[PDB]
Protein backbone atom coordinates (compact mmCIF):
# COMPACT_ATOMS: atom_id res chain seq x y z
CA UNK A 1 0.00 0.00 0.00
CA UNK A 2 3.09 2.21 -0.14
CA UNK A 3 3.12 2.75 -3.91
CA UNK A 4 -0.60 3.57 -3.92
CA UNK A 5 -0.17 6.18 -1.18
CA UNK A 6 2.87 7.60 -2.98
CA UNK A 7 0.90 7.95 -6.22
CA UNK A 8 -2.05 9.51 -4.39
CA UNK A 9 0.21 12.06 -2.67
CA UNK A 10 2.13 12.82 -5.88
CA UNK A 11 -0.98 13.32 -8.03
CA UNK A 12 -2.67 15.83 -5.71
CA UNK A 13 0.16 18.37 -5.99
CA UNK A 14 -0.52 18.43 -9.75
CA UNK A 15 -4.32 18.22 -9.56
CA UNK A 16 -4.56 21.16 -7.14
CA UNK A 17 -2.01 23.51 -8.71
CA UNK A 18 -0.80 23.30 -12.34
CA UNK A 19 2.80 24.42 -12.85
CA UNK A 20 4.81 27.11 -11.03
CA UNK A 21 7.33 29.54 -12.52
CA UNK A 22 10.89 29.98 -11.18
CA UNK A 23 12.11 32.91 -13.30
CA UNK A 24 8.88 34.91 -13.17
CA UNK A 25 8.10 34.47 -9.45
CA UNK A 26 10.17 32.78 -6.75
CA UNK A 27 10.08 29.23 -5.35
CA UNK A 28 8.74 29.51 -1.79
CA UNK A 29 5.13 29.63 -3.03
CA UNK A 30 5.18 26.08 -4.41
CA UNK A 31 6.88 24.94 -1.20
CA UNK A 32 4.17 26.55 0.93
CA UNK A 33 1.49 25.03 -1.31
CA UNK A 34 2.89 21.50 -1.06
CA UNK A 35 3.36 21.97 2.69
CA UNK A 36 -0.29 22.98 3.07
CA UNK A 37 -1.29 20.00 0.93
CA UNK A 38 0.71 17.63 3.15
CA UNK A 39 -0.83 19.23 6.25
CA UNK A 40 -4.40 18.91 4.99
CA UNK A 41 -3.90 15.33 3.78
CA UNK A 42 -2.41 14.40 7.15
CA UNK A 43 -5.34 16.03 8.94
CA UNK A 44 -7.77 14.09 6.73
CA UNK A 45 -5.88 10.83 7.35
CA UNK A 46 -5.83 11.32 11.13
CA UNK A 47 -9.61 11.94 11.07
CA UNK A 48 -10.76 9.01 8.91
CA UNK A 49 -12.55 5.69 9.38
CA UNK A 50 -11.80 3.24 6.56
CA UNK A 51 -10.21 3.56 3.11
CA UNK A 52 -12.92 4.43 0.57
CA UNK A 53 -14.45 7.28 2.59
CA UNK A 54 -11.02 8.90 3.03
CA UNK A 55 -10.41 8.79 -0.73
CA UNK A 56 -13.89 10.22 -1.37
CA UNK A 57 -13.27 13.05 1.10
CA UNK A 58 -9.88 13.77 -0.49
CA UNK A 59 -11.47 13.90 -3.95
CA UNK A 60 -14.18 16.23 -2.65
CA UNK A 61 -11.54 18.48 -1.08
CA UNK A 62 -9.59 18.56 -4.36
CA UNK A 63 -12.79 19.49 -6.22
CA UNK A 64 -13.62 22.23 -3.71
CA UNK A 65 -10.10 23.65 -4.01
CA UNK A 66 -10.37 23.58 -7.81
CA UNK A 67 -13.73 25.39 -7.58
CA UNK A 68 -11.92 28.70 -7.00
CA UNK A 69 -8.84 28.37 -9.25
CA UNK A 70 -10.75 28.11 -12.53
CA UNK A 71 -9.87 31.29 -14.48
CA UNK A 72 -12.87 31.47 -16.81
CA UNK A 73 -12.28 32.52 -20.41
CA UNK A 74 -13.24 36.02 -21.50
CA UNK A 75 -14.85 34.61 -24.68
CA UNK A 76 -17.29 32.43 -22.71
CA UNK A 77 -20.83 33.76 -23.19
CA UNK A 78 -23.99 31.79 -22.35
CA UNK A 79 -22.65 28.26 -21.81
CA UNK A 80 -23.63 25.73 -19.16
CA UNK A 81 -21.65 22.86 -17.66
CA UNK A 82 -24.21 20.36 -18.97
CA UNK A 83 -23.40 21.48 -22.52
CA UNK A 84 -19.70 21.00 -21.75
CA UNK A 85 -20.33 17.47 -20.47
CA UNK A 86 -22.41 16.70 -23.56
CA UNK A 87 -19.65 17.99 -25.84
CA UNK A 88 -17.11 15.87 -23.95
CA UNK A 89 -19.28 12.77 -24.34
CA UNK A 90 -19.73 13.54 -28.05
CA UNK A 91 -15.95 13.90 -28.45
CA UNK A 92 -15.42 10.57 -26.68
CA UNK A 93 -17.99 8.91 -28.95
CA UNK A 94 -16.32 10.41 -32.03
CA UNK A 95 -12.93 9.09 -30.88
CA UNK A 96 -14.46 5.65 -30.29
CA UNK A 97 -16.02 5.71 -33.77
CA UNK A 98 -12.69 6.72 -35.32
CA UNK A 99 -10.97 3.86 -33.47
CA UNK A 100 -13.62 1.39 -34.66
CA UNK A 101 -13.27 2.60 -38.26
CA UNK A 102 -9.47 2.32 -38.04
CA UNK A 103 -9.82 -1.24 -36.74
CA UNK A 104 -12.19 -2.05 -39.61
CA UNK A 105 -9.75 -0.57 -42.13
CA UNK A 106 -6.89 -2.59 -40.63
CA UNK A 107 -9.00 -5.77 -40.56
CA UNK A 108 -9.95 -5.85 -44.26
CA UNK A 109 -6.52 -5.05 -45.75
CA UNK A 110 -5.09 -8.36 -44.50
CA UNK A 111 -4.36 -11.47 -46.58
CA UNK A 112 -7.34 -13.55 -45.40
CA UNK A 113 -9.76 -10.83 -46.55
CA UNK A 114 -8.20 -9.30 -49.71
CA UNK A 115 -10.52 -6.27 -49.87
CA UNK A 116 -8.49 -3.14 -50.61
CA UNK A 117 -11.46 -0.97 -51.59
CA UNK A 118 -13.25 -1.73 -48.31
CA UNK A 119 -10.07 -0.81 -46.42
CA UNK A 120 -9.77 2.44 -48.37
CA UNK A 121 -13.42 3.32 -47.69
CA UNK A 122 -13.02 2.58 -43.98
CA UNK A 123 -9.84 4.67 -43.85
CA UNK A 124 -11.65 7.56 -45.56
CA UNK A 125 -14.51 7.27 -43.06
CA UNK A 126 -12.01 7.24 -40.18
CA UNK A 127 -10.33 10.35 -41.58
CA UNK A 128 -13.71 12.08 -41.90
CA UNK A 129 -14.60 11.21 -38.30
CA UNK A 130 -11.19 12.44 -37.15
CA UNK A 131 -11.68 15.75 -38.98
CA UNK A 132 -15.16 16.10 -37.48
CA UNK A 133 -13.77 15.47 -33.99
CA UNK A 134 -11.01 18.03 -34.55
CA UNK A 135 -13.60 20.56 -35.76
CA UNK A 136 -15.72 19.91 -32.66
CA UNK A 137 -12.66 20.40 -30.45
CA UNK A 138 -11.82 23.66 -32.23
CA UNK A 139 -15.41 24.89 -31.88
CA UNK A 140 -15.35 24.07 -28.16
CA UNK A 141 -12.03 25.89 -27.77
CA UNK A 142 -13.42 28.96 -29.56
CA UNK A 143 -16.41 29.10 -27.19
CA UNK A 144 -14.14 28.81 -24.14
CA UNK A 145 -15.22 25.41 -22.82
CA UNK A 146 -12.68 23.08 -21.28
CA UNK A 147 -11.81 19.76 -22.92
CA UNK A 148 -10.89 16.80 -20.69
CA UNK A 149 -9.59 14.03 -22.95
CA UNK A 150 -10.00 10.62 -21.31
CA UNK A 151 -9.26 7.04 -22.37
CA UNK A 152 -10.52 5.73 -25.71
CA UNK A 153 -12.48 2.49 -25.50
CA UNK A 154 -11.63 -0.45 -27.75
CA UNK A 155 -14.09 -2.28 -30.02
CA UNK A 156 -15.80 -5.14 -28.20
CA UNK A 157 -15.59 -7.31 -31.36
CA UNK A 158 -11.96 -7.67 -32.45
CA UNK A 159 -12.98 -10.14 -35.19
CA UNK A 160 -15.59 -8.38 -37.34
CA UNK A 161 -16.83 -11.72 -38.76
CA UNK A 162 -16.98 -10.78 -42.45
CA UNK A 163 -18.48 -7.82 -44.30
CA UNK A 164 -22.20 -7.87 -43.51
CA UNK A 165 -21.59 -7.90 -39.75
CA UNK A 166 -19.09 -5.05 -40.11
CA UNK A 167 -21.62 -3.02 -42.11
CA UNK A 168 -24.32 -3.68 -39.50
CA UNK A 169 -21.96 -2.63 -36.70
CA UNK A 170 -21.07 0.55 -38.60
CA UNK A 171 -24.77 1.30 -39.13
CA UNK A 172 -25.49 0.78 -35.43
CA UNK A 173 -22.57 3.06 -34.55
CA UNK A 174 -23.85 5.76 -36.91
CA UNK A 175 -27.33 5.45 -35.38
CA UNK A 176 -25.83 5.83 -31.90
CA UNK A 177 -23.89 8.91 -33.05
CA UNK A 178 -27.09 10.37 -34.51
CA UNK A 179 -28.95 9.70 -31.25
CA UNK A 180 -26.15 11.39 -29.29
CA UNK A 181 -26.31 14.40 -31.63
CA UNK A 182 -30.09 14.60 -31.17
CA UNK A 183 -29.65 14.48 -27.38
CA UNK A 184 -27.01 17.22 -27.61
CA UNK A 185 -29.35 19.37 -29.72
CA UNK A 186 -32.18 18.85 -27.23
CA UNK A 187 -29.93 19.73 -24.29
CA UNK A 188 -28.67 22.86 -26.05
CA UNK A 189 -32.25 23.90 -26.85
CA UNK A 190 -33.39 23.34 -23.25
CA UNK A 191 -30.33 25.15 -21.83
CA UNK A 192 -30.58 28.19 -24.16
CA UNK A 193 -27.86 27.45 -26.74
CA UNK A 194 -29.05 28.12 -30.29
CA UNK A 195 -25.63 28.57 -31.92
CA UNK A 196 -24.16 25.21 -30.90
CA UNK A 197 -27.29 23.19 -31.67
CA UNK A 198 -27.74 24.97 -35.01
CA UNK A 199 -24.13 24.29 -35.99
CA UNK A 200 -24.52 20.63 -34.99
CA UNK A 201 -27.75 20.18 -36.94
CA UNK A 202 -26.34 22.02 -39.97
CA UNK A 203 -22.72 20.89 -40.41
CA UNK A 204 -22.93 17.40 -38.89
CA UNK A 205 -26.40 15.84 -39.14
CA UNK A 206 -26.36 15.95 -42.96
CA UNK A 207 -23.15 13.92 -43.17
CA UNK A 208 -24.52 11.49 -40.58
CA UNK A 209 -27.73 10.99 -42.58
CA UNK A 210 -25.71 10.49 -45.77
CA UNK A 211 -23.48 7.92 -44.07
CA UNK A 212 -26.50 6.08 -42.63
CA UNK A 213 -28.13 5.98 -46.07
CA UNK A 214 -24.93 4.71 -47.69
CA UNK A 215 -24.50 2.00 -45.05
CA UNK A 216 -28.13 0.97 -45.48
CA UNK A 217 -27.66 0.72 -49.24
CA UNK A 218 -24.51 -1.36 -48.70
CA UNK A 219 -26.34 -3.70 -46.30
CA UNK A 220 -29.22 -4.06 -48.78
CA UNK A 221 -26.77 -4.88 -51.58
CA UNK A 222 -24.94 -7.44 -49.43
CA UNK A 223 -28.25 -9.07 -48.46
CA UNK A 224 -29.62 -9.19 -52.02
CA UNK A 225 -26.43 -10.36 -53.74
CA UNK A 226 -25.43 -12.93 -51.12
CA UNK A 227 -22.94 -11.99 -48.40
CA UNK A 228 -21.38 -13.51 -46.48
CA UNK A 229 -23.20 -16.51 -47.96
CA UNK A 230 -20.89 -16.39 -51.01
CA UNK A 231 -17.51 -14.79 -51.62
CA UNK A 232 -18.54 -13.74 -55.13
CA UNK A 233 -20.88 -11.01 -53.86
CA UNK A 234 -18.19 -9.45 -51.66
CA UNK A 235 -15.67 -9.45 -54.52
CA UNK A 236 -18.16 -7.90 -56.94
CA UNK A 237 -19.19 -5.22 -54.43
CA UNK A 238 -15.50 -4.50 -53.86
CA UNK A 239 -14.67 -4.24 -57.58
CA UNK A 240 -17.84 -2.34 -58.58
CA UNK A 241 -19.21 -0.11 -55.80
CA UNK A 242 -16.10 0.81 -53.80
CA UNK A 243 -13.84 0.09 -56.79
Amino acid sequence: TQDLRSHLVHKLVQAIFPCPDPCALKDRRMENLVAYAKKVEGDMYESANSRDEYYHLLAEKIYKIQKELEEKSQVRQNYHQDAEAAINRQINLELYASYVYLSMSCYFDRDDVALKNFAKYFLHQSHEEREHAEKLMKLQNQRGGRIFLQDIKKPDRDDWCSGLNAMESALHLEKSVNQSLLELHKLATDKNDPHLCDFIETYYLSEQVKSIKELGDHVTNLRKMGAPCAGMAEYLFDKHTLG
Binding site: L4, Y55, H56, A59, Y63, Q81, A85, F148, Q150
Partner: peptide
Protein backbone atom coordinates in the same frame (compact mmCIF):
# COMPACT_ATOMS: atom_id res chain seq x y z
CA UNK B 1 -20.43 18.17 -5.94
CA UNK B 2 -21.68 15.96 -8.79
CA UNK B 3 -22.45 18.93 -11.06
CA UNK B 4 -19.29 18.35 -13.13
CA UNK B 5 -18.22 15.12 -14.93
CA UNK B 6 -14.80 15.22 -13.23
CA UNK B 7 -16.67 14.07 -10.11
CA UNK B 8 -17.64 10.76 -11.71
CA UNK B 9 -14.25 10.60 -13.46
CA UNK B 10 -12.23 10.81 -10.24
CA UNK B 11 -14.72 8.50 -8.50
CA UNK B 12 -14.28 5.80 -11.16
CA UNK B 13 -10.50 6.32 -11.15
CA UNK B 14 -10.32 5.86 -7.37
CA UNK B 15 -12.63 2.84 -7.54
CA UNK B 16 -10.47 1.20 -10.22
CA UNK B 17 -7.14 2.00 -8.54
CA UNK B 18 -8.04 1.26 -4.92
CA UNK B 19 -9.41 -2.27 -4.23
Amino acid sequence: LSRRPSYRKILNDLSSDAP
